[PDB]
mmCIF file of C-alpha atoms and ligand atoms in Angstrom:
data_model
loop_
_atom_site.group_PDB
_atom_site.id
_atom_site.type_symbol
_atom_site.label_atom_id
_atom_site.label_comp_id
_atom_site.label_asym_id
_atom_site.label_seq_id
_atom_site.Cartn_x
_atom_site.Cartn_y
_atom_site.Cartn_z
ATOM 1 C CA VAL A 182 124.382 102.957 78.842
ATOM 2 C CA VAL A 183 123.050 101.538 82.133
ATOM 3 C CA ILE A 184 125.502 98.869 83.272
ATOM 4 C CA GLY A 185 124.000 95.553 84.308
ATOM 5 C CA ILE A 186 120.418 96.074 83.154
ATOM 6 C CA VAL A 187 118.278 92.947 82.821
ATOM 7 C CA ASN A 188 115.364 91.821 80.671
ATOM 8 C CA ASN A 189 111.689 91.558 81.629
ATOM 9 C CA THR A 190 108.335 93.095 80.710
ATOM 10 C CA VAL A 191 106.382 95.976 82.239
ATOM 11 C CA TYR A 192 102.600 95.709 82.511
ATOM 12 C CA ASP A 193 100.662 98.839 81.616
ATOM 13 C CA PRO A 194 98.008 99.510 84.286
ATOM 14 C CA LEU A 195 95.759 100.484 81.388
ATOM 15 C CA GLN A 196 96.649 97.201 79.663
ATOM 16 C CA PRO A 197 94.074 95.152 81.640
ATOM 17 C CA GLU A 198 91.965 98.323 81.561
ATOM 18 C CA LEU A 199 92.072 97.930 77.773
ATOM 19 C CA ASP A 200 92.556 94.164 77.406
ATOM 20 C CA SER A 201 89.141 94.007 79.075
ATOM 21 C CA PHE A 202 87.983 97.119 77.172
ATOM 22 C CA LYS A 203 89.578 97.155 73.708
ATOM 23 C CA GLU A 204 88.742 93.455 73.515
ATOM 24 C CA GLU A 205 85.333 94.482 74.839
ATOM 25 C CA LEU A 206 85.332 97.005 71.998
ATOM 26 C CA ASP A 207 86.641 94.208 69.772
ATOM 27 C CA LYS A 208 83.884 91.938 71.091
ATOM 28 C CA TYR A 209 81.455 94.767 70.341
ATOM 29 C CA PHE A 210 83.167 95.037 66.954
ATOM 30 C CA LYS A 211 82.676 91.286 66.503
ATOM 31 C CA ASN A 212 79.009 91.885 67.411
ATOM 32 C CA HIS A 213 78.435 93.666 64.079
ATOM 33 C CA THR A 214 81.262 92.637 61.742
ATOM 34 C CA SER A 215 80.211 89.001 61.301
ATOM 35 C CA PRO A 216 76.600 89.603 60.200
ATOM 36 C CA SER B 112 126.317 97.371 104.191
ATOM 37 C CA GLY B 113 125.614 101.014 103.386
ATOM 38 C CA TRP B 114 124.265 102.831 106.437
ATOM 39 C CA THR B 115 122.053 100.074 107.857
ATOM 40 C CA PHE B 116 124.768 98.545 110.060
ATOM 41 C CA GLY B 117 124.231 101.175 112.765
ATOM 42 C CA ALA B 118 120.609 100.291 113.573
ATOM 43 C CA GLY B 119 120.506 96.499 113.628
ATOM 44 C CA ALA B 120 121.837 93.639 111.550
ATOM 45 C CA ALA B 121 124.077 94.675 108.665
ATOM 46 C CA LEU B 122 122.474 94.127 105.252
ATOM 47 C CA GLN B 123 124.713 94.003 102.197
ATOM 48 C CA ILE B 124 124.018 95.990 99.023
ATOM 49 C CA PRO B 125 126.158 96.641 95.911
ATOM 50 C CA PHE B 126 128.142 99.853 96.212
ATOM 51 C CA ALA B 127 127.247 101.221 92.778
ATOM 52 C CA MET B 128 123.601 100.960 93.848
ATOM 53 C CA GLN B 129 124.081 102.363 97.357
ATOM 54 C CA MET B 130 125.221 105.735 96.021
ATOM 55 C CA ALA B 131 121.988 105.945 94.022
ATOM 56 C CA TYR B 132 120.175 106.164 97.362
ATOM 57 C CA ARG B 133 122.421 108.980 98.604
ATOM 58 C CA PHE B 134 121.591 111.053 95.527
ATOM 59 C CA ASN B 135 117.905 110.313 96.086
ATOM 60 C CA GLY B 136 118.216 112.024 99.464
ATOM 61 C CA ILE B 137 119.835 115.141 98.008
ATOM 62 C CA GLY B 138 117.029 115.883 95.565
ATOM 63 C CA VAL B 139 118.274 114.502 92.245
ATOM 64 C CA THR B 140 116.700 111.424 90.709
ATOM 65 C CA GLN B 141 118.754 108.247 90.608
ATOM 66 C CA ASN B 142 118.943 108.159 86.807
ATOM 67 C CA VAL B 143 121.707 110.786 86.860
ATOM 68 C CA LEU B 144 124.110 108.354 88.546
ATOM 69 C CA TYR B 145 123.753 105.265 86.354
ATOM 70 C CA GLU B 146 124.066 107.373 83.200
ATOM 71 C CA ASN B 147 127.217 108.988 84.624
ATOM 72 C CA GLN B 148 128.734 106.205 86.727
ATOM 73 C CA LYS B 149 132.012 106.149 84.807
ATOM 74 C CA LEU B 150 132.379 109.936 84.883
ATOM 75 C CA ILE B 151 131.549 110.131 88.593
ATOM 76 C CA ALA B 152 133.912 107.297 89.524
ATOM 77 C CA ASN B 153 136.769 108.924 87.618
ATOM 78 C CA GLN B 154 135.855 112.179 89.373
ATOM 79 C CA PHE B 155 136.081 110.541 92.820
ATOM 80 C CA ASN B 156 139.261 108.480 92.415
ATOM 81 C CA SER B 157 141.187 111.591 91.380
ATOM 82 C CA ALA B 158 139.856 113.663 94.284
ATOM 83 C CA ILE B 159 141.001 111.243 96.993
ATOM 84 C CA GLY B 160 144.532 111.318 95.581
ATOM 85 C CA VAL C 122 91.434 92.841 108.667
ATOM 86 C CA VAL C 123 91.880 96.544 109.447
ATOM 87 C CA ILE C 124 89.888 97.752 112.444
ATOM 88 C CA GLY C 125 87.514 100.659 111.951
ATOM 89 C CA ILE C 126 87.207 100.444 108.165
ATOM 90 C CA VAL C 127 84.057 101.961 106.669
ATOM 91 C CA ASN C 128 82.152 101.656 103.396
ATOM 92 C CA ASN C 129 81.969 104.225 100.600
ATOM 93 C CA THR C 130 82.305 104.487 96.828
ATOM 94 C CA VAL C 131 85.792 105.279 95.538
ATOM 95 C CA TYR C 132 85.274 107.576 92.562
ATOM 96 C CA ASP C 133 87.917 106.473 90.077
ATOM 97 C CA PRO C 134 88.755 109.126 87.438
ATOM 98 C CA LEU C 135 89.803 106.248 85.204
ATOM 99 C CA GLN C 136 86.060 105.656 84.758
ATOM 100 C CA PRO C 137 84.972 109.158 83.599
ATOM 101 C CA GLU C 138 88.016 109.127 81.324
ATOM 102 C CA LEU C 139 86.418 105.995 79.882
ATOM 103 C CA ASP C 140 82.722 106.262 80.838
ATOM 104 C CA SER C 141 82.392 109.622 79.101
ATOM 105 C CA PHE C 142 84.137 107.877 76.218
ATOM 106 C CA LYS C 143 81.888 104.865 76.828
ATOM 107 C CA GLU C 144 79.157 107.484 76.452
ATOM 108 C CA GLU C 145 80.895 108.104 73.097
ATOM 109 C CA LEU C 146 82.336 104.698 72.144
ATOM 110 C CA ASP C 147 79.104 102.825 72.851
ATOM 111 C CA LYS C 148 77.221 105.745 71.304
ATOM 112 C CA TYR C 149 79.249 105.129 68.144
ATOM 113 C CA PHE C 150 78.333 101.435 68.280
ATOM 114 C CA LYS C 151 74.710 102.351 69.004
ATOM 115 C CA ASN C 152 74.970 104.754 66.062
ATOM 116 C CA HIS C 153 76.582 101.836 64.168
ATOM 117 C CA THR C 154 74.292 98.926 65.091
ATOM 118 C CA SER C 155 71.017 100.861 64.812
ATOM 119 C CA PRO C 156 71.105 101.355 61.016
HETATM 120 C C1 LIG D 529 117.382 91.543 76.182
HETATM 121 O O1 LIG D 529 116.622 91.246 75.016
HETATM 122 C C2 LIG D 529 117.077 91.943 73.846
HETATM 123 C C3 LIG D 529 116.114 91.597 72.734
HETATM 124 O O2 LIG D 529 114.767 91.838 73.119
HETATM 125 C C4 LIG D 529 118.519 91.555 73.531
HETATM 126 O O3 LIG D 529 118.981 92.367 72.458
HETATM 127 C C5 LIG D 529 119.479 91.545 71.388
HETATM 128 O O4 LIG D 529 120.830 91.136 71.619
HETATM 129 C C6 LIG D 529 121.370 90.313 70.574
HETATM 130 C C7 LIG D 529 122.749 89.888 71.023
HETATM 131 O O5 LIG D 529 122.970 88.506 70.779
HETATM 132 C C8 LIG D 529 121.381 91.089 69.261
HETATM 133 O O6 LIG D 529 121.865 90.250 68.218
HETATM 134 C C9 LIG D 529 122.872 90.969 67.474
HETATM 135 O O7 LIG D 529 122.405 91.286 66.164
HETATM 136 C C10 LIG D 529 123.350 92.024 65.376
HETATM 137 C C11 LIG D 529 122.671 92.445 64.087
HETATM 138 O O8 LIG D 529 121.776 93.510 64.380
HETATM 139 C C12 LIG D 529 124.571 91.127 65.145
HETATM 140 O O9 LIG D 529 125.525 91.817 64.354
HETATM 141 C C13 LIG D 529 125.189 90.740 66.498
HETATM 142 O O10 LIG D 529 126.313 89.891 66.297
HETATM 143 C C14 LIG D 529 124.152 90.095 67.421
HETATM 144 O O11 LIG D 529 123.865 88.813 66.885
HETATM 145 C C15 LIG D 529 119.976 91.578 68.933
HETATM 146 O O12 LIG D 529 120.005 92.407 67.776
HETATM 147 C C16 LIG D 529 119.402 92.368 70.105
HETATM 148 N N1 LIG D 529 118.034 92.773 69.827
HETATM 149 C C17 LIG D 529 117.723 93.900 69.179
HETATM 150 C C18 LIG D 529 116.261 94.163 68.982
HETATM 151 O O13 LIG D 529 118.584 94.672 68.769
HETATM 152 C C19 LIG D 529 119.414 91.774 74.745
HETATM 153 O O14 LIG D 529 120.709 91.244 74.494
HETATM 154 C C20 LIG D 529 118.824 91.098 75.979
HETATM 155 N N2 LIG D 529 119.629 91.392 77.154
HETATM 156 C C21 LIG D 529 120.078 90.447 77.985
HETATM 157 C C22 LIG D 529 120.893 90.927 79.147
HETATM 158 O O15 LIG D 529 119.838 89.257 77.807
HETATM 159 C C1 LIG D 530 79.988 97.345 104.185
HETATM 160 O O1 LIG D 530 79.567 96.650 103.009
HETATM 161 C C2 LIG D 530 79.665 95.222 103.116
HETATM 162 C C3 LIG D 530 79.283 94.659 101.767
HETATM 163 O O2 LIG D 530 77.874 94.662 101.583
HETATM 164 C C4 LIG D 530 78.772 94.726 104.248
HETATM 165 O O3 LIG D 530 78.937 93.320 104.396
HETATM 166 C C5 LIG D 530 77.644 92.690 104.304
HETATM 167 O O4 LIG D 530 76.706 93.292 105.206
HETATM 168 C C6 LIG D 530 75.393 92.720 105.130
HETATM 169 C C7 LIG D 530 74.513 93.529 106.053
HETATM 170 O O5 LIG D 530 74.132 94.763 105.458
HETATM 171 C C8 LIG D 530 75.450 91.241 105.503
HETATM 172 O O6 LIG D 530 74.156 90.670 105.351
HETATM 173 C C9 LIG D 530 76.446 90.512 104.611
HETATM 174 O O7 LIG D 530 76.593 89.166 105.049
HETATM 175 C C10 LIG D 530 77.803 91.209 104.642
HETATM 176 N N1 LIG D 530 78.728 90.563 103.725
HETATM 177 C C11 LIG D 530 79.876 90.003 104.120
HETATM 178 C C12 LIG D 530 80.709 89.383 103.041
HETATM 179 O O8 LIG D 530 80.226 89.999 105.296
HETATM 180 C C13 LIG D 530 79.134 95.430 105.550
HETATM 181 O O9 LIG D 530 78.217 95.062 106.574
HETATM 182 C C14 LIG D 530 79.104 96.943 105.363
HETATM 183 N N2 LIG D 530 79.520 97.616 106.582
HETATM 184 C C15 LIG D 530 79.116 98.848 106.911
HETATM 185 C C16 LIG D 530 79.644 99.388 108.204
HETATM 186 O O10 LIG D 530 78.363 99.497 106.193
HETATM 187 C C1 NAG D 531 75.249 92.902 70.479
HETATM 188 O O1 NAG D 531 74.377 93.975 70.099
HETATM 189 C C2 NAG D 531 73.016 93.796 70.518
HETATM 190 C C3 NAG D 531 72.231 94.957 69.955
HETATM 191 O O2 NAG D 531 72.621 95.249 68.620
HETATM 192 C C4 NAG D 531 72.952 93.713 72.040
HETATM 193 O O3 NAG D 531 71.608 93.469 72.440
HETATM 194 C C5 NAG D 531 73.857 92.597 72.544
HETATM 195 O O4 NAG D 531 73.887 92.606 73.967
HETATM 196 C C6 NAG D 531 75.273 92.773 72.003
HETATM 197 N N1 NAG D 531 76.120 91.666 72.419
HETATM 198 C C7 NAG D 531 76.782 91.647 73.580
HETATM 199 C C8 NAG D 531 77.608 90.425 73.845
HETATM 200 O O5 NAG D 531 76.717 92.574 74.381
HETATM 201 C C1 NAG D 532 76.154 108.759 63.444
HETATM 202 O O1 NAG D 532 76.853 108.342 62.264
HETATM 203 C C2 NAG D 532 76.614 109.177 61.123
HETATM 204 C C3 NAG D 532 77.343 108.545 59.960
HETATM 205 O O2 NAG D 532 77.440 107.135 60.114
HETATM 206 C C4 NAG D 532 77.079 110.602 61.415
HETATM 207 O O3 NAG D 532 76.768 111.434 60.304
HETATM 208 C C5 NAG D 532 76.399 111.132 62.670
HETATM 209 O O4 NAG D 532 76.932 112.406 63.012
HETATM 210 C C6 NAG D 532 76.602 110.168 63.836
HETATM 211 N N1 NAG D 532 75.890 110.634 65.015
HETATM 212 C C7 NAG D 532 76.499 110.929 66.167
HETATM 213 C C8 NAG D 532 75.610 111.395 67.280
HETATM 214 O O5 NAG D 532 77.714 110.823 66.306
#
């Protein structure tokens, strides 16, 4: 309904706070899954 | 130029966007204008006549 | 660059809303890697 809107992406402030943490959790997950 | 031509160099700005600032001074968020631009415009053209 | 700036620790509530969970998430991993 908004006339003239455009396309881009919005970065979650928590996204780096989880891309460095969920991946850190994932890295911690990788620390036990492989063996 | 909105209302910035009385305090220096005039700076252009689209009219449909300028009114969104005037609402923001009243106390209503700007999302009420874009979602009702057609209704508001039809409600302003008729009034001036 | 700013004149008169002083040092201190900025307590970021983003940390206790993760550190307390890090006290729980890493506790889970500690509870997961220990056995
Ligand atoms: C911004 O990006 C979005 C996608 O992230 C664009 O929405 C997409 O617009 C196209 C229009 O070419 C849609 O294709 C249409 O598909 C229908 C079938 O569903 C078909 O009948 C139409 O003829 C047309 O091909 C596409 O579906 C739509 N994406 C989604 C998820 O619905 C949007 O257009 C972009 N905006 C700008 C300003 O570029
Ligand atoms: C604020 O903290 C900074 C960071 O440690 C201080 O800068 C360092 O200060 C030490 C002296 O304690 C110097 O040896 C370092 O060379 C400084 N580092 C840099 C990059 O300049 C700063 O002095 C502290 N200021 C106050 C007022 O506490
Ligand atoms: C993987 O876990 C061990 C203990 O199980 C720990 O010592 C090690 O630091 C972990 N790996 C990383 C990259 O932190
Ligand atoms: C550790 O894990 C076991 C099951 O894997 C669970 O029963 C126990 O409550 C856990 N301990 C803590 C402190 O969460």
